[PDB]
Symmetry: D2
Subunit: 121 residues, 4 copies
Amino acid sequence: GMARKRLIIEMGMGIDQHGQEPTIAASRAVRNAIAHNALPGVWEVAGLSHPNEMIIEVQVAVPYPEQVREEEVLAVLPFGRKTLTVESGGMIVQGRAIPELNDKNDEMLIAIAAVTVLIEN
Amino acid sequence: GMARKRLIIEMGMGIDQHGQEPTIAASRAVRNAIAHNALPGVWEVAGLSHPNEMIIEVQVAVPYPEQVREEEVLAVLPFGRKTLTVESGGMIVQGRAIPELNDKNDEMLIAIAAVTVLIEN
Amino acid sequence: GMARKRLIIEMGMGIDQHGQEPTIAASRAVRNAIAHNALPGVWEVAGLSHPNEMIIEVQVAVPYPEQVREEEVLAVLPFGRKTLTVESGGMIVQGRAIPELNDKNDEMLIAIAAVTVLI
Amino acid sequence: GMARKRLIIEMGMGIDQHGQEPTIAASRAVRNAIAHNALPGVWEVAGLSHPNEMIIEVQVAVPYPEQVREEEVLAVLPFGRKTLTVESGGMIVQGRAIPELNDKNDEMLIAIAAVTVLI
Ligand SMILES: [Cl-]
Ligand SMILES: [Cl-]
Ligand SMILES: [Cl-]
Ligand SMILES: [Cl-]
């Protein structure tokens, strides 16, 4: 692809409390990363005709990264030219499954997402 | 002042759990608003020579807004040409003071901050 | 009202970026309040037979509280004997509506939620 | 190890934007984990005479865990009989160092903290 410049990086954490769903942790992390920010004008100032033209790169770190369903994670972003990378990281919290809380196994999975908005150089 | 265009809006919540310090709630809200984002390039793309040239407007809503110490709140921002508005809003959580937790009165004060980065037109 | 002991209070913020949907801001605030905590043993130390027996009181401050669909907000909580009280508060962020971002009007609505577990 | 009952688990994220300071990311993560919750009655239902008697276990995942100043991280917690375990994890965000923002190197370090109250 064409070289690009980083504009803003939005970071967030997401948690799968029941276990076995790193995709859920990852999706929630992307949502958390962007939910508290709004981008009314940066895209204009950068020279785009619409926010859907912005380049958005997502970097996720989570346990069992190979189990993350990419399409579901990227669909959290409302617009843009989107890419995702998934790598091992985040954290596992070990603890005996609580049936009353609908736990699937003895792990809570925590993902981190960095959502970067870039402009082509 | 010169008219300006909104680029990004970063929102956060801050809480004074002991009571009597809306300034603390407000300061924590501004910190929360910006802590999870980084701005490596937007300022460049917008035409500034340094991030300290960016216009940063802070809007805070909190109980007892008249008690907020402006200078302390604005010092949370690491750079920029800064302004603050404080208005009544946020929320008060009522509850009997717990001496063991060092409560000052029967209220927890919750502030909201919107930190907007703008560029002059 | 009744005097009950407060155990834990979880606080969160939620935002309706497009305007006219205080319910969305409120629902997101309750989610933000509870999403990053787990209560594996609170129900047991409280002497309850199941988490669904927990007494949970929710306080929300948001612009246009009268427009909040309350049961929708309470549905965010997976368990408990729940009640919600809505009041005017939180914050309105005003600014020109951005049609390209699907804004409904010139306001962003911010809600605060406090979720309290009582005994 | 010992088998103790978990009551509540509070989770948070913290970030060192300038690089080379995993301690800062870790401290901020513990703060983020607890800042938005209050525990007015947990110590009492646990049968303790004061919140300072609460057993608190902290688990942190961050890049360069060996460099974390542990007591500094634990100092974020106002009360309790506290312990911390640090492991490699969280995330490194790589990108060109921005001298104008006082970056130390080309990394941003992100830590995760889980704060558990046990009985
Ligand atoms: Cl989450
Ligand atoms: Cl806070
Ligand atoms: Cl939100
Ligand atoms: Cl942080």
